[PDB]
Amino acid sequence: FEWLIGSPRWRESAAERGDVNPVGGLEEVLYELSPIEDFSGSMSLSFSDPRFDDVKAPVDECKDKDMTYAAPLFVTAEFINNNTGEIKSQTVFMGDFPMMTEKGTFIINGTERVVVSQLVRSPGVYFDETIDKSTDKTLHSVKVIPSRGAWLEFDVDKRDTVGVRIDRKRRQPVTVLLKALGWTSEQIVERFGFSEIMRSTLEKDNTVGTDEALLDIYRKLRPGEPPTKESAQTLLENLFFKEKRYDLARVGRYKVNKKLGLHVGEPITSSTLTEEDVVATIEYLVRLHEGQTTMTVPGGVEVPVETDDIDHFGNRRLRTVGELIQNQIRVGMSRMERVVRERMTTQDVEAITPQTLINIRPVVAAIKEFFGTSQLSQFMDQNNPLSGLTHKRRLSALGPGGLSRERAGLEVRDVHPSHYGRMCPIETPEGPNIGLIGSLSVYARVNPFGFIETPYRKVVDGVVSDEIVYLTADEEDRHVVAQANSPIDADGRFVEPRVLVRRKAGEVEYVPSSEVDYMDVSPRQMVSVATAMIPFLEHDDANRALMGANMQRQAVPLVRSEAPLVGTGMELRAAIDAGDVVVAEESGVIEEVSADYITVMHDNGTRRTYRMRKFARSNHGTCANQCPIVDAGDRVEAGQVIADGPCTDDGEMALGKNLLVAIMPWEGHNYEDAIILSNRLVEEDVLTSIHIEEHEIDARDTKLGAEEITRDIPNISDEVLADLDERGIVRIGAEVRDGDILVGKVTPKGETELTPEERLLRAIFGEKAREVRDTSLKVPHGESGKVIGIRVFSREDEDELPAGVNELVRVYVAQKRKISDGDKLAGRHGNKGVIGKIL
Amino acid sequence: FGEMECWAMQAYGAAYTLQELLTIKSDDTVGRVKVYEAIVKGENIPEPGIPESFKVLLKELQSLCLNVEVLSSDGAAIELREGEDEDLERAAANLGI
Amino acid sequence: LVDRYGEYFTGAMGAESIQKLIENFDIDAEAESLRDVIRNGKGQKKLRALKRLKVVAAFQQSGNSPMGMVLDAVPVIPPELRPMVQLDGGRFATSDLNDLYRRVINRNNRLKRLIDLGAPEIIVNNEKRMLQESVDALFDNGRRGRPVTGPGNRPLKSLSDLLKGKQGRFRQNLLGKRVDYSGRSVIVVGPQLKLHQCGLPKLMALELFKPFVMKRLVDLNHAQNIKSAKRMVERQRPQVWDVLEEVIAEHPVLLNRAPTLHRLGIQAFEPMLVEGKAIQLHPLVCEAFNADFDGDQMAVHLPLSAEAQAEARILMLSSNNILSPASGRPLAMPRLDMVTGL
Amino acid sequence: DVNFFDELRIGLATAEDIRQWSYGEVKKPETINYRTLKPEKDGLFCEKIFGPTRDWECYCGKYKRVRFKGIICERCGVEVTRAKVRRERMGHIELAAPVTHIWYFKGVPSRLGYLLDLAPKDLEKIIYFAAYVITSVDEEMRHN
Amino acid sequence: ATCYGRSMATGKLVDIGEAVGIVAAQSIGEPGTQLTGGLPRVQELFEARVPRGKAPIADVTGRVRLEDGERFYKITIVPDDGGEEVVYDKISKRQRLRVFKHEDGSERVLSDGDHVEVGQQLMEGSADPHEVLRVQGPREVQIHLVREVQEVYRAQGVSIHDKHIEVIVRQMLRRVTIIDSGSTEFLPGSLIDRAEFEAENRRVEPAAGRPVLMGITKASLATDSWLSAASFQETTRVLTDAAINCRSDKLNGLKENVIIGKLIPAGTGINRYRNIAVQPTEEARAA
Amino acid sequence: DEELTARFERDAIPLLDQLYGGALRMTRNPADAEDLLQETMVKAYAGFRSFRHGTNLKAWLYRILTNTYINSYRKKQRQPAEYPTEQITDWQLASNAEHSSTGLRSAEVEALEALPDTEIKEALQALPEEFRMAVYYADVEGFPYKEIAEIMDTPIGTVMSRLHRGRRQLRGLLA
DNA sequence: CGGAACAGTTGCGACTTAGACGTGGTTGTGGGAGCTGCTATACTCTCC
DNA sequence: GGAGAGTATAGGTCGAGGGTGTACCACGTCTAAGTCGCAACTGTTCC
RNA sequence: CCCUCGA
Ligand SMILES: [Zn+2]
């Protein structure tokens, strides 16, 4: 997200990695968009230098008011008249831009959300050799995948013919398209003649000539229309070779470059397919099915001819949050461009300023539609800080641009040798989503092109140095990497002459130490954050280790936390980075401390105060409660933990308690995974947790009238109303059991809905009051607690409500839950069970 | 109570339990009310009626331009409807008129 | 071909032409022709002929005409079966059927409006094609071409989708249903239980038995009328518990754990009022239910009529099925701790 | 209603069948008016054809009572009866042009193809207006 | 009841009205999760599919021309009579020629010029059950199916009593293929129930048919109840076909009784049990 | 005039395959693109006499298309949203019934309401039969005094006296 | 425990309205997103 | 006639908690809300 | 329906 904004932090890190003249995510969208020209070239509009204003509201404000955490976006829009030479430079407000919080989340309509990184296939060229034909003979396929554009497929037939499919269009001899590109039937025989299958295909080609080829191509695309020569050639030009409707990214360009060896001189100029790329693709495929192991192309050098692994992480890419948001920005921005063009013809020049041309509605709407409707924009899972932390580290294969759940085979869900140090092989769901969702490894990074890197130690002349290099999956296959468990002495020399390593395409071998390139920077390098927290993980089978990683994120925050006696050392760094703990940004002395806030006086004389989240409801109903761990007068340092969070104790993740355990059958109550507990854990509240429910109710307009929230509930005893206030809303601090009224509400009832008996009494007693039904909000069955909060929004006031809704009331109930028979306990090793008896 | 749960009931060969689950415990609209009425009065459980989901099935079939009829042994079809007077007669009888 | 000779023949496209070919179709002639080809013919043409005669002979019987394969009128399903509900936030939700019907109505009405304006033949034919496509989508969507999609590119669910599939009417709403007088909870081990008994939480048993309790404490002085009994049970007044103990005696219940792989996945037990919110399962039946006690939950069903109670006591009682119905071997048998103990 | 059910029969429903089932034609795309929250007349939810949404209440409101059971409002055409009829009452649409029932065309094998001895690709070209078909020729006149 | 024998659950003779097909299906399906060949083989057997790794079988006694060259196997059989020579088309070299005991000979592998009996397997592997049906007759296919099916469960440590698999296999051949219609109106090639086939044969037998083996899916969709078949598979297809044929469901099935809310014709729902009349004896009424 | 029809079929129809590709851009759905192009052609043919013979037809038709899409677009934007759903969730049904005039009634509620109300019945029994009939008609069935008098064969004044007196009687009887 | 006489209320029935709301016309360009990363099996069509 | 290809079908059960609206103007056409009178209609009040 | 999760 810092790259999207073009943050100064990103700039410095960009200068550190070296500067390509780095452009932010927004900057790139603005520069590709500019200039916006009239179709006559008479006028132009250009954008530059985007800036973000201050945030509209603080985070907890948006959470309370159902707002979106956002900042106004400003751009400098310069309009130029190509005739008069007059220039108009203006400042335009582009919208309220949803902002990433300090915790790496977004607040959309008050609810906190996470954008999961998406696993997709990078643009490029991928060759697939299928031997599964019924003839038992091997076939060879290829796909050309761009970032945005039209699909192009070449297939050598089971009948021995080279086919072409364009955006699912039906096959034609590969020569048909090549001819239609301006190729003679003879010139194909010059380059492609070495292929006996291409020789057989040109005779099976039904027609020759560029006019008949281009005409046959335009027929395949449009079912019922007329062909035209200049229309079809400009159509084929704009379908592939033009930048507007077809875009290979720089990733796709380089991948095609490296895969075909076309440009060695590293030109960065343009990313689009080329005629030489089509020729190179067919030539690569031609030699492939023949069985050649290498190919050299005119102006190209020594590329192996081989199939590509679809699941390899050099061919598989990660679209991060900044890139997803950038894509939406590009869509809505292109819409705004369309509006500006339509507005250039209508308006009177010198009566136009940019702000009259610029309509920002489709941009804001484009952003809103993403966070609302996208599978990647997700309700944040906060059971405890660990469930929320890994959620932000999730790598998801499902979504737009990804694969459908229906179309995901068992080969996508398997651990892959390119995952090592990149995606954790352990942490992943055990349900239907197994293998479709994964966790970033502890030391992994996402490189600027979307590929995941892992650090390694340079091994020079059999010595293990401290020089660190981040390698991608492709770079890792060229070298020999020793596992971390490989012993080394004080000197860099290996202890053993033979060491088990991964060398080529994920094979494990006893290997000479003499030739070793790199070595793992540590154990746990291949493992996620939650998996790195399992003590003695190496002694647990991968299945129970999976169960352990998922079960830690299901732990409820206890009324009091306790750190484990036995950790892995990951618990502290996990709690701090998760961000549910309060940390001092600057070193100083504690000037004042209470349960409400902590203020630190820096040596500057400037002070900084940290407000405490107190009994806050998480998305899943657990209790987010922060407590200060520091005292007045204490000296603290930058990075030190000031206050504990829900599952933290002294800054280390505490997901449970240390219990005294005996391993033995006891009188059948622990039979088959059932667990027996001491009633001490009930009496001393060691397993007790706080759970906060949100009950919502609104009065709206109905067929027979408007609903009213009231304390006047027909035929209801005054005794049961005793805890309601004067509005009909239950009073703060009341103890509510199932069936008790939280909020009284009445709804208009028609005459026909009265019982004959109810009709008689109302008539003879002269009751003229409105006929109503009791719609009051009541506590659901099996619920109890104390009322800890109330929010009311009225149409009488300026509170913004949906159409037809007069009043909206939320009631928050908090319950203390003692551990009990039927609750589920687990250890970190996958060992689970219900409590069968408490004794 | 799903498909496999019904297989178990059939495997036990318990007909009345399976019929009771799929009519007066779920679908049958007059039966579900008459059953509760019988328990409160301490009487025997009434005989089940027709499940609503079958009438719904017939209607979805007609909407496919399939003409489906439930035929008696006579060979003539059977209208599926309820007399609307029984509820009004009981309500009028409850007031003494 | 119409400009000249147009008075010597008639031709059309669309379904009106197919309706014409059917109207002019001689059924008996084509049937006897097919039978001749089956008799005196051989090879693949004999197969084609037979397969055709299945259809034609099917239509040969009276009361059944091929004309029904072309519709001049499309039926509309009652609205309760395709309802429309208001949502929090002032928005609405409709069944896909309403949107499909809406497309049919819009294209039919536009076809009328084009017929009245004397529109060019190509446009009227376009509207007829679109009407045919929309009635296609309404009946079976996606069966031909690409499906009509609502918001999110989700293809709408046609009238064929109601019947078929695991979520269809047959499988979900007919061969199975949700039922009254049922509950569920997590199961814990019942080691103190006899084989024919199961632990039932107090609140579960009070809800499931609510009418029986109500009548019983109405008969006793506790409740003045049945409605006072209802309100008295909903508040859990202390008088109910004793009464509950009385109404539950020798009244069996059904316990079920999913998936049900065989009939022992449902067994009948005598309920015992038990403290806590968990269902207590006898240790010996865990083989039949495959209950792991790692958080497994089970469901409870209450037999009502004399026949249902009798079936539970006799047919389904836990201690009346000890043996595996597959291999005849013993099923409720010591295992795990018990075995070790012995 | 007990088990007197003997057989259950299907047939093709003729247009006459469909119009006999129907309680009225649905002529309008509108569903319900937002302000009134009441079903638009001659629409998919129309009370006149499908029945009243509230027990014993017609659309105009002239009759709200059981006293009127069985009568049809002169103004709105709704019938005073139970809303239960809204689950048993069907409508219909009269088509400006004939339409094939896709079960009998696109299903494999194509029933229309076997009935008329037509290729399903050709049948498709006809039904979807990509090809003309000859309904009749005059043999005598052409010969003369 | 007597042909079925003991009820494994009660240990006694099976009661009249016990639904033993559902019990058989549950008994076969419940262990299915434990089968790691394997469960796909149980499917391949129950659906009567031509097996992969097909093993040819001899049609008639005679002499064998064994070509078997250039990574290919080809088997011609010249019958002992003047009949035409049957030729098996393609047999891959990955298959093994069967080792067996040749009649009037020793135990050895199949060789060129050998003499073979009628039902001899030409190769080692899975036999096409349809071939063993049309050659060795139905009572042999019963043996082959029950043994090959039970074999998979035995290998996995699961014991199913043979009688369940026998129930399913019984349902697998109820029918005959119509060859010559005769005077009997039966369309040739259709699959007609054996009882109905023998009943429709009236000289005052013209209908010719041969026993069929049909998988459980095809046998299920072939039931006389369009209501039962519509709720199983291919609902669109079944409903179109049933509408065109003006089929009338008789409602006698138990799944149909479930749908319409009628007591299933099994167990306590049988006419024998449900119509029982209960009366107290005179001596008891006295007291 | 038939001149407009022929000239329309020669000039306008070849533009369809163009205009349709435009309609897509607005709808991004093929069905709504078809409907849009068709309504556009309705407007164009109906209004083709207003088009100037030599002027460019493509821009004219394009503007008709856009404007039609906007009429439809603002029209849909004024209405509250209708979301097509494959299935209406049970949560949606209950949530909707919380605001309903009549909620989701259990079989228990239906069975209890159907039971006789004893107090009311016995109180009505104490009334004289005439007062009972009249008060019944009026206060339950809702008859007017005219119709009640027509049914009971008495003057309307009798209906008034019996209504008042039976009502006060029930008031003293039931409290 | 009636039948007029007499005096309070809904309630239907008109009409003015002010605004949402749909209609006139409609004239320089201008052709969508999304995907395709499922397996296995039976059988009609259709190209030959 | 006869073979490939193209299209059709199927793919576990039961539970818990969550879930969305870029785009022409300048106007006449209609409607969505009314305040307001007589009948028509409810009620007392008697003799 | 979809997301995600339990057996
Ligand atoms: Zn009316």
Numbering used by the authors:
A (entry chain C): 61 to 899
B (entry chain C): 1068 to 1164
C (entry chain D): 244 to 585
D (entry chain D): 3 to 146
E (entry chain D): 976 to 1011, 1026 to 1193, 1199 to 1281
F (entry chain F): 22 to 196
What does the article say, verbatim?
After forming a complex with the RNA polymerase (RNAP) core enzyme, σ factors guide RNAP to promoter DNA, open double-stranded DNA (dsDNA) to form a transcription bubble, facilitate synthesis of initial short RNA transcripts, and later assist in promoter escape. The ECF σ factors are the largest family of alternative σ factors. Mycobacterium tuberculosis has 10 ECF σ factors (σC, σD, σE, σG, σH, σI, σJ, σK, σL, and σM); deletion of ECF σ factors from M. tuberculosis results in attenuated disease progression (e.g., sigC and sigD) or in alleviated virulence (e.g., sigE and sigH). Our structures show that σH binds to RNAP in a similar way to σA, in which σ2 and σ4 stay on the surface of RNAP, and σ3.2 inserts into the active center.
We also report the crystal structure of an ECF σ factor-RNAP transcription initiation complex comprising M. tuberculosis σH-RNAP holoenzyme, a full transcription bubble of promoter DNA, and an RNA primer at 2.80 Å resolution. The synthetic scaffold comprises an upstream DNA duplex (−34 to −10 with respect to transcription start site at +1) with a consensus −35 element (GGAACA), a non-complimentary transcription bubble (−9 to +2) with a consensus −10 element (GTT), a 7-nt RNA primer complimentary to template DNA (−6 to +1), and a downstream DNA duplex (+3 to +13). In the structure, σH4 binds to the major groove of dsDNA of the −35 element and makes base-specific polar interactions with nucleotides at three (−34, −33, and −31) out of six positions. The G−34(nt) makes two H-bonds with R186 through its O6 and N7 atoms; the G−33(nt) makes one H-bond with S182 through its O6 atom; and the A−31(nt) makes one H-bond with M181. The electron density map unambiguously shows that the T:A base pair at position −10 (corresponding to position −12 of promoters for σA) is unwound, despite the fact that the −10 nucleotides in the synthetic nucleotide scaffold were designed to be complimentary. This observation strongly suggests that σH2 unwinds promoter DNA at the −11/−10 junction (corresponding to (−13)/(−12) of promoters targeted by σA; Fig. 4e and Supplementary Fig. 6c, d). In the structure, N88 blocks the pathway of upstream dsDNA and serves as a wedge to disrupt the stacking of base pairs at the positions −11 and −10. T−9(nt) is flipped out and inserted into a protein pocket formed by the “specificity loop” of σH234. A surprising finding in the σH-RPo crystal structure is that σH2 flips the guanine base of G−5(nt) (corresponding to the (−7) position of σA-regulated promoters) and inserts into a shallow pocket created by σH2 and the RNAP-β gate loop. The guanine base of G+2(nt) is inserted into the “G” pocket in σH-RPo and makes essentially the same interaction with residues in the “G” pocket as the G(+2)(nt) does in the σA-RPo complex. The 5′ terminus of the 7-nt RNA is positioned very closely to the tip of σH3.2; extending the RNA by even one additional nucleotide would likely result in steric hindrance.
